[PDB]
Amino acid sequence: LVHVASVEKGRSYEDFQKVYNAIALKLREDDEYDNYIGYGPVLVRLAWHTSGTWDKHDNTGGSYGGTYRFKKEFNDPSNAGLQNGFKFLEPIHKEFPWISSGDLFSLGGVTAVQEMQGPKIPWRCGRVDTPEDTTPDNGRLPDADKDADYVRTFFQRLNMNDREVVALMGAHALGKTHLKRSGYEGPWGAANNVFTNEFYLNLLNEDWKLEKNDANNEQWDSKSGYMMLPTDYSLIQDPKYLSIVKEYANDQDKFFKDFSKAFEKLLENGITFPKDAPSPFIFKTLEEQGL
Numbered sequence: 001l002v003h004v005a006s007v008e009k010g011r012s013y014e015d016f017q018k019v020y021n022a023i024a025l026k027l028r029e030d031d032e033y034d035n036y037i038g039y040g041p042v043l044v045r046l047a048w049h050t051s052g053t054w055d056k057h058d059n060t061g062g063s064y065g066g067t068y069r070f071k072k073e074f075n076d077p078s079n080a081g082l083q084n085g086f087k088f089l090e091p092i093h094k095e096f097p098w099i100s101s102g103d104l105f106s107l108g109g110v111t112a113v114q115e116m117q118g119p120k121i122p123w124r125c126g127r128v129d130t131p132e133d134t135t136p137d138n139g140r141l142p143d144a145d146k147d148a149d150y151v152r153t154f155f156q157r158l159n160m161n162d163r164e165v166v167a168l169m170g171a172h173a174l175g176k177t178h179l180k181r182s183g184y185e186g187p188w189g190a191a192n193n194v195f196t197n198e199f200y201l202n203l204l205n206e207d208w209k210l211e212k213n214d215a216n217n218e219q220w221d222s223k224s225g226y227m228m229l230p231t232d233y234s235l236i237q238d239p240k241y242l243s244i245v246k247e248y249a250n251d252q253d254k255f256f257k258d259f260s261k262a263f264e265k266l267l268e269n270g271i272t273f274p275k276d277a278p279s280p281f282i283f284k285t286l287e288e289q290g291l
């Protein structure tokens, strides 16, 4: 199965900047969500989980088909809580019914990262909705109770290498774990709706204790009130990951650049872009537009 990007008919960068802007304005307006964290983090996670079902071996799953809109995928236990991101995007989709579902879920993530003062993420249009029977089964998203070997093997299926994995994991600066959702509870740091390299700094610099949470799962906790999942912590247990963690803890620009590449890549696995497709779009933030 080849998934060829097909530009929404007649649309160009300005159309997608309008969708960006509507997402960004709603992010600003709907600020109460999740104890005033706002929707940025869950939109980033929605973009990732709608992309992260991809299997490089047969091109099943991935962002192209926008299959989260079907019940098998929106009810995946791994996706618990993402319905909030979907509901956020619903009025956006109503205003801009021409955008494909995959384009909207992925654009939500881009918009969230950028509006949270993260790197620019080039974004390409052209995902096309595919039918219900193309929805990938549950079980393709990763478990959090595992070690570095698990993480490394997991991400090979998404064609991500060590650097790409460690970079992508930096998104765990954002938002928080919610016990009733994942069986883990707590934020990873203080700046959880501003995109920074804090995840790496906290991994290296906090004093972590292995504790059990109220769902009886182990997680790493600090006196500052932060947590790390076992898979997060694996990034400093594994010496290869550790080197990269230290790199990003010590160079914010490098983290931004590597995250941007890896996140675009994640959002684009599985999609074939024709030679004459538009170049990737770099959207202006609301701030850059004076909006």
Ligand code: HEM
Binding pocket: 041, 042, 044, 045, 048, 081, 142, 143, 144, 145, 151, 168, 169, 171, 172, 174, 175, 176, 177, 178, 179, 181, 182, 183, 184, 229, 231, 263
């Ligand atoms: C080994 C890989 C990963 C595992 C096991 C993992 C696991 C988790 C878990 C258990 C949660 C908490 C869900 C909840 O209780 O609300 C979470 C939240 C989150 N994850 Fe991941 N994650 C991984 C990779 C990633 C990647 C690659 C990204 C995106 C680049 C990402 C972005 C997020 C965000 C932004 C949140 C916060 C969501 C919110 O506040 O609503 N994660 N992750």
